[PDB]
Scaffold this active site. Structure first.
Site, short mmCIF file in Angstrom:
data_model
loop_
_atom_site.label_atom_id
_atom_site.label_comp_id
_atom_site.label_asym_id
_atom_site.label_seq_id
_atom_site.Cartn_x
_atom_site.Cartn_y
_atom_site.Cartn_z
N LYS B 27 -4.73 -2.17 14.32
CA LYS B 27 -5.64 -2.08 13.14
C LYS B 27 -6.45 -3.35 12.73
O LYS B 27 -7.68 -3.32 12.57
CB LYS B 27 -4.79 -1.90 11.89
CG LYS B 27 -4.96 -0.57 11.16
CD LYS B 27 -4.05 -0.50 9.93
CE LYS B 27 -4.12 0.84 9.21
NZ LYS B 27 -3.03 1.75 9.57
N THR B 28 -5.74 -4.43 12.43
CA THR B 28 -6.34 -5.72 11.96
C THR B 28 -7.25 -6.28 13.07
O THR B 28 -8.44 -6.57 12.80
CB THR B 28 -5.18 -6.65 11.64
OG1 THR B 28 -4.08 -6.35 12.49
CG2 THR B 28 -4.69 -6.48 10.19
N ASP B 213 -10.30 -0.65 5.33
CA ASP B 213 -8.97 -0.47 5.90
C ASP B 213 -8.14 0.46 5.02
O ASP B 213 -8.59 0.89 3.96
CB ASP B 213 -8.24 -1.81 6.01
CG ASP B 213 -6.95 -1.75 6.87
OD1 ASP B 213 -6.79 -0.78 7.65
OD2 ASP B 213 -6.11 -2.69 6.79
N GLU B 214 -6.92 0.74 5.48
CA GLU B 214 -5.93 1.57 4.80
C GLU B 214 -6.56 2.71 4.03
O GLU B 214 -6.25 2.92 2.86
CB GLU B 214 -5.13 0.71 3.87
CG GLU B 214 -3.67 0.71 4.19
CD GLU B 214 -3.24 -0.45 5.06
OE1 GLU B 214 -3.13 -1.60 4.54
OE2 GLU B 214 -3.00 -0.21 6.26
N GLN B 244 0.54 8.18 7.12
CA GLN B 244 1.09 7.05 6.41
C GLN B 244 0.70 7.09 4.91
O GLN B 244 1.04 6.19 4.14
CB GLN B 244 0.75 5.73 7.13
CG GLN B 244 1.73 5.38 8.30
CD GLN B 244 1.41 4.07 9.09
OE1 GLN B 244 2.06 3.01 8.92
NE2 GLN B 244 0.42 4.17 10.00
N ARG B 598 8.82 1.28 11.23
CA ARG B 598 8.89 -0.13 10.86
C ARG B 598 9.81 -1.01 11.72
O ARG B 598 9.64 -2.24 11.79
CB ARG B 598 9.33 -0.21 9.40
CG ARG B 598 8.49 0.64 8.49
CD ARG B 598 7.11 0.04 8.43
NE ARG B 598 6.04 0.85 9.01
CZ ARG B 598 5.08 0.36 9.79
NH1 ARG B 598 5.09 -0.92 10.12
NH2 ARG B 598 4.01 1.10 10.10
#
Lengths: 633, 636
Positions: B27-28, B213-214, B244, B598
């Site tokens: 993602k980042t 994002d998110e 998520q 996680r």
DNA sequence: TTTTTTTTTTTTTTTT
């Protein structure tokens, strides 16, 4: 339904109120109901009422009833709790406020005393009673919002100047290591709430209305903490009886009810006088006994039950005779009136007066409870001794052997024990017995089968002899393993081993008198003498046996306040200090604890120090109303 | 290279596009890269791209990465920010085009709740958990661009129609005293933006390309803001994973990924699916569990990393033996494997279950960290100091004056304040400012006025000064009222004071360097330094705490651990009753999904066999979740 | 001579 006073106390919800509940007046009903009302009749949200008490018992007890009248919901969040729970919970909750948190385990009683020992070794004697003072006296200056130096100021006396210094190192180590004794939990938020307004009000608004039971026990710290908790909004209801103040020697401000009246003058004293437990006769005596005390608030008790039976005053010849008579009379009553062992209670001033009753009681297969204290028959030194005797009398009690094996101090490791057990187990028998089978010889050998034989021998040859000379045998069982030495090595301060031993003789001598039998008591086989002892080793029927102090706030159909001599009840110590008023309260309590019949007893003679003394009847017995009292002969 | 998915995500820069980055996706990277690329390979000008996020962290995080693949030139001059910062900025900026005074007040949630408390007394039960729903539920009619009236319409239930009212009361007080809670930060520009065209374009032309994002967390206003910002070109790239979406209860439309698919013609979902963190077993498990949940968007995690150890499922007997075995096994695993408590994470659905683990870990000299504990921006000693600053830079902030006047402790009684207010009221202006009208002198005087004036003056003088020497002013503000000493009197133990104090210093310092300016970020005026602190851009930042990572399931949201201990795996707890007896659990599902995803090396479930619930007890049945999981890789 | 005192769970998550 609510008797007027109760009713009144229940309804007066608008200001600083004090309910002076005389004994057996039913305070907890009021309190509950007060709460219940406060909620249902004046909105006053559950979560805004704090019910404080001293014991974690009153606590649950009160919670019990509350929820029993209040519906699961509405009863939500009731600050019912001990002082200490809250006091701590303040410290806790406001520490989390600054964003931070706390973490320093309360130094639970022992830990303290303990720490106090190491703290004062050379300084102060290796003695319990001593340390006690040290502890107490320390916990006092603390409730006297003082410092370990300010206390050297207000410190007159040798060991006191010491206690001060010692005191110094106490807070010293604690402030340091970061922990706090109990009373700290109070003088903690107390300060933290005085010094800071931000917090103060938040509580002042959490705790909208506060009720406090057992107010006559209140100490400074609590007292203040309370004030701080509701300063002048004063929407509360403190509850007590000043005639039941007895823990004064422990920071309880007697004049609490009065002091209250000062730094709170719109105080509305509502008093509960109706009693629901004691006969009229008991109340009359109590009522009178206590009027000999300089009295402030007038309180004159009364019940709607029948006048009882005369208060008898049995006069015993000596320390033993007493117990004998009681236990004796306890039994008769009981038989003839088909009642329960728990309907009875035996109360005394000091803890020793118990020992002897513990004898007869036990000696007469009369079940009991040593509420005020620790039953002689538990004290390890005696538990151990018992077990040998249990073994002797019964070589099938692995329980006992397993316990006495090495405990008197041999070298029979767990191995040499688990292997004998393991072979004893499959050969189906007792360890001691199997500790003789020639087939066990090679399942386990070495030095362990070299101590097990020896010991298991020493016992059997003694057990053999006990068969005709119990005493001798036991006597030999004693010096044999030199428990004496053992104790001195195992016991902390020698003085303890000395006493721990003293006990051991005591037991034996008892056991002896019994084997010896007597004029009217046909002698006992050691097997029975044992079983008698053993039985000892709550939904149980048994005679409440405790100190007056232990008794505070309880009741029983039949009481035997024993040892009503001068030195004793009017405790010599206090006798000579001119404070008696308390002792008197002490008695008056005692008295107001009995509900159907009460009997006093005194020894006609006591052993001063080998020096025998002819004591005089606790003046108390005299101030009582002679028409209803029946001195014996 | 960069794995294909990632790549295509990066190359696609021609229209409305969505990247469905699964858990571990990368993602980042992609975002940074896409911005770097937008600029470099696509000619986009650093100053025309905006990368919106949710937290002031990712934002800093992102700004770092990006910043290091370009230089301050293109870098520090780019629009990476949280929603709110942007939303606010839109407010500010276009207030300036209008040339108006932006003196409203940001009501940090705490400030919010309290106001409610008061405004909500006899009406509602003095309780935390209560207020919360009130707050949240309130922050949502808002997030649903709804009036305190139309909300009473869309109100069903008693304590609910109550709320609506209370809401009415909330919005009522806000609108009046001129303050705005965070949600207004988004709801304002949005409205401001759709109601006027002149501005719209202006922004439509500033943010030539946006990336968000998110996205699965996007709420309405948020989304709507986007739409507005992006208008018709659709040049943008939102990124996420509806699997998520867990803060649905706080306004997050889960269906966003979908909703998007509609108001936007050529949405081109690009889906990153390769994990690079959890073992194939974990992924296995997780990828499976999630499948029980309905699906409009089809994907499947899958890492290259070796398939790992069996997912173990320790069954404990009571509330405490659970923590007991965990801490125990924790210790064991670390001992013989040697892997810092940091490698270790324990995660619960709620916070009570923390209360028992904190014990054993501490009981075993195990150092650890506790999920979430009152933002620094909430320590009283701070909110106080803030207030001053607030007032200094904005004298029109009664709330702030109101909190300070007497606090650091002068003798300004509530009367003296009652009357300032009244005078200040009638003359329609600040308490602070009113404090000077010569006319006030008559409504009030005596000693209060003396205290009052003395104070507000001193303050003024500082205010005046700060004009030139911000720190020296603040510096004197502190020493001036002797806050230190103050703390030492107010604070419980002395150490807490020192601490409370230390906290003060720190704030000072951040403020400083913020003012003193970065060589990555251009220096700030004190008014800004403030707005930042107001957004709690505490600016966090080598030698991290090698202790236990203990946190909620929610506190996991994108975070990775080698070994996790997903405790309290019973029905009631994990699949929470709230949800259980609600018809939606899908959420709780995700919740778990996450929790699982996680851990990277080895996961371990755990369930209490008996409750401490109801004051009594209960024989609970395992989180159904536990059973929807691949039995093969699962143990007992 | 006499002797209480308790760090949980309040029973769902929390950027900004």
């Amino acid at each position: 339904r609510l008797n007027p006073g109760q009713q009144q106390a229940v309804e007066f919800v608008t200001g600083p109120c004090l309910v002076l509940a005389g004994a057996g007046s039913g305070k907890t009903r009021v309190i509950t109901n007060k709460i219940a009302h406060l909620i249902r009749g004046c909105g006053y949200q559950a979560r805004h009422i704090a019910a404080v008490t001293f014991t974690n018992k009153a606590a649950r007890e009160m919670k019990e009833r509350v929820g029993q009248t209040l519906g699961r919901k509405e009863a939500r969040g009731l600050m019912i709790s001990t002082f200490h729970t809250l006091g701590l919970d303040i410290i806790k909750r406001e520490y989390a406020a600054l964003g931070m948190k706390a973490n320093f385990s309360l130094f639970d009683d022992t830990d303290q005393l303990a720490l106090l020992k190491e703290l004062t070794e050379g300084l102060i004697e290796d003695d319990k009673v001593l340390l006690q003072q040290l502890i107490s006296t320390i916990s006092n200056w603390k409730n006297d919002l003082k410092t370990p130096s300010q206390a050297a100021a207000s410190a007159i006396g040798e060991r006191d100047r010491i206690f001060a210094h010692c005191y110094g190192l106490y807070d010293a180590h604690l402030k340091a290591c970061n922990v706090l004794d109990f009373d700290d939990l109070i003088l903690l938020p107390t300060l933290l709430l005085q010094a800071n307004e931000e917090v103060r009000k938040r509580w002042q608004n959490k705790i909208r209305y506060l009720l406090v039971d057992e107010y006559q026990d209140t100490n400074t710290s609590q007292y203040e903490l309370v004030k701080l908790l509701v300063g002048s909004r004063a929407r509360f209801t403190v509850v007590g009886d000043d005639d039941q103040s007895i823990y004064s020697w422990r920071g309880a401000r007697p004049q609490n009810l009065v002091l209250l009246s000062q730094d709170f003058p719109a105080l509305k004293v509502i008093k509960l006088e109706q009693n629901y437990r004691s006969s009229g006769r008991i109340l009359k005596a109590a009522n009178i006994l206590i009027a000999n005390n300089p009295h402030v608030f007038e309180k004159r008790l009364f019940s709607e039950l029948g006048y009882g039976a005369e208060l008898k005053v049995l006069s015993a010849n000596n320390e033993e005779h007493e117990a004998e008579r009681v236990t004796g009379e306890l039994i008769a009553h009981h038989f003839v009136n088909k009642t329960q062992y728990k309907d009875y209670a035996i109360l005394y001033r000091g803890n020793h007066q118990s020992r002897v009753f513990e004898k007869f009681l036990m000696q007469n297969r009369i079940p009991y409870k040593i509420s005020g204290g620790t039953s002689f028959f538990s004290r390890p030194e005696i538990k151990d001794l018992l077990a040998y005797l249990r073994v002797l009398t019964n070589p099938d009690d692995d329980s006992a052997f397993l316990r006495i094996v090495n405990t008197p101090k041999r070298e029979i490791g767990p191995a040499t024990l688990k292997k004998l057990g393991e072979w004893a187990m499959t050969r189906n028998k007792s360890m001691f017995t199997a500790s003789f089978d020639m087939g066990l010889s090679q399942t386990l050998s070495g030095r362990g089968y070299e101590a097990l034989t020896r010991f298991t021998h020493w016992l059997a040859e003694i057990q053999r002899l006990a068969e005709r000379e119990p005493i001798a045998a036991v006597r030999d069982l004693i010096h044999g393993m030199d428990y004496e030495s053992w104790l001195y090595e195992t016991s902390p301060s020698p003085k303890a081993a000395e006493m721990r031993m003293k006990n051991v003789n005591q037991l034996f001598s008892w056991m002896t008198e019994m084997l010896e039998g007597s004029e009217l008591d046909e002698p006992m086989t050691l097997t029975q003498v044992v079983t008698r002892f053993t039985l000892r080793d709550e939904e149980l029927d048994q005679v409440q046996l405790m100190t007056l102090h232990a008794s505070k706030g309880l009741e029983f159909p039949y009481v035997y306040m024993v040892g009503m001599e001068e030195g004793f009840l009017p405790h010599q110590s206090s006798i000579d200090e001119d404070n008696i008023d308390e002792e008197r309260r002490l008695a008056y309590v005692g008295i107001t604890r009995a509900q159907k019949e009460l009997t006093f007893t005194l020894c006609k003679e006591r052993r001063q120090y080998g020096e025998l003394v002819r004591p005089e009847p606790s003046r108390f017995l005299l101030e009582l109303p002679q028409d209803d009292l029946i001195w014996e002969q």
